[model samples]
Target: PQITLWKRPLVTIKIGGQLKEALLDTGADDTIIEEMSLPGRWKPKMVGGIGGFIKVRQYDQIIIEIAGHKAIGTVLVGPTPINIIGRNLLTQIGATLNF
Candidate 1:
């Protein structure tokens, strides 16, 4: 579906059985969420953002539901200023940029 760009482009999503709001950040390469408990194994990775860099746990095969569309992809859990839905999951949901 066509996504209308907003100042933040916030959207509702469900991750790890919890409902939360996330920003549709096209500039981001991967989806990022606040620090949370996740099952399985993960590796510590460094990510650079608008404000320098930070460490995060990269979890694979995370299922996220966005607007009823379920997308299984990678999610980085860390100290993010905001939850972001990046192009990885955005492409899975068939999101398009059209202004």
Candidate 2:
């Protein structure tokens, strides 16, 4: 009966420099950041793919960190589940599933 914490550490984001709690998710293949949590300077593009059309964009200088490693990534900003941490952070840290 061992209770474990959430997978990976919870990530915090800055929406136009405002810090907020962000859930780190490994299940998601793509980065799906919340539209409201995105900064004003973040210019997103409408994605036209297999799932039809959706607005998405990559923002430069997205300051992010995992454990202690810091990185500035070009994250795809769009509608999401409040907040999320996708492959953008996992791949950087070489994260993998043990199960």
Candidate 3:
């Protein structure tokens, strides 16, 4: 789907069979979601954003469906203000910044 940059690129996504909304953030390098229970082992890792760095749980090989596109990669679970789909998954889905 073609999206304009005038507003936040929010889209519906599915993870672990659960559906949720997330922002398509091109500026973010890693995908991060709110703290939640996922069926898998995770490692504690630190990630930084606009404000500062925060501890997060890194889960690998997670399948995420973004706007009907499927991608399997690492997903970080942390105390993020909102769910974000970053370049990791975006690259898999062939997302590009078309002007």
Candidate 4:
């Protein structure tokens, strides 16, 4: 289904049986979550962003549900200002930017 994009597009997503709100970021290539207890092992990775880079734990095989659509992928855990749903999951859920 087509979804309209807002300035700060927010959506409800479930991760690790926990519900949270995430910002839809088209500029981001990968999904990032705030510090949480992920279900599996993670590899240490450094990701770059607008300001600089931050070290994060990359958890693979994560299942997240966004607006009723389920997507399985990797989620980076770090000290992010807010949870972000990036292009990786957005494409999987068939979300398009409709201005």
Best by lDDT: 3
- Tens-digit lDDT string for candidate 1 (1-99): 466654658889998899999998889999999988888999889999877999999999988898789999899999999899999998999887775
Superpose all Cα atoms of candidate 2 onto the true structure and report the RMSD in Å to 1 decimal: 4.9
lDDT of 3 by residue, 10-63 (tens): 999999789999999999999999978887799999998789999999999998
Which of candidates 3 and 4 is the stronger one according to TM-score? Answer: 3
Q: Higher lDDT: candidate 2 or 4?
A: 4
Model 2 lDDT per residue over 16-92, tens place: 55566766566655555666454447675775444576777777667766444565676777765456667767677
Lowest lDDT sum, 10 consecutive residues, model 2, at: 1-10
- By descending TM-score, how would the candidates be arranged? 3, 1, 4, 2
Query: Candidate 4: what lDDT?
Result: 0.89
The models' CA-based lDDT, in order, is: 0.89, 0.61, 0.93, 0.89
Q: Summing lDDT over every window of 10 consecutive residues in candidate 1, give the lowest-scoring window.
A: 1-10
Per-model root-mean-square deviation over C-alphas = 1.3, 4.9, 0.8, 1.5
| Alpha-carbon TM-score of each model against the true structure | 0.92, 0.57, 0.95, 0.90
Q: Say what the RMSD of model 4 is.
A: 1.5
Instruction: Name the Cα RMSD for model 3.
Output: 0.8
